[PDB]
């Protein structure tokens, strides 16, 4: 059991893709402003995301996908 990786397959990857590159120029993921702590990737998530409908993704789905992101997405920290 995922539960990050399952909610970011149903609520992200249409927009961000599987491995976190979906986008233009790469994406918007790796090497991320706050993609570096845990806590403020997590409540940019909680503040914005799902785009235009941040509500879609509770406190503990936005937690459980900043995890996942950063446990999977090589160079997702900014250098
Ligand atoms: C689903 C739960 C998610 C998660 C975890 C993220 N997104 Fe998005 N995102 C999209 C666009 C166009 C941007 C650029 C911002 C803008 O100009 O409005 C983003 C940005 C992000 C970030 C980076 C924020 C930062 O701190 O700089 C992160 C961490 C992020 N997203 C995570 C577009 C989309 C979508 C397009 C329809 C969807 C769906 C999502 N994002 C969903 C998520
Ligand atoms: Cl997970
Ligand atoms: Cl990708
Ligand atoms: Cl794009």
């Known amino acids: 059991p995922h539960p990050g990786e399952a909610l970011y397959e149903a609520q992200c990857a249409s927009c961000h893709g599987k491995d976190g590159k979906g986008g233009l120029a790469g994406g918007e993921l790796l090497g991320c402003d706050v ?3 845990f806590s403020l ?4 998530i909680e503040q914005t995301m ?13 937690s459980q996908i900043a995890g996942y ?7 997702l920290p900014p250098t």
Do not use: H, I, V
């Open 35 to 37: 993609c570096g702590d």
């Open 41 to 44: 990737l997590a409540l940019r």
């Open 50 to 62: 799902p785009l235009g409908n941040p509500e879609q993704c509770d406190t503990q789905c936005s």
């Open 69 to 75: 992101m950063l446990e999977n997405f090589a160079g």
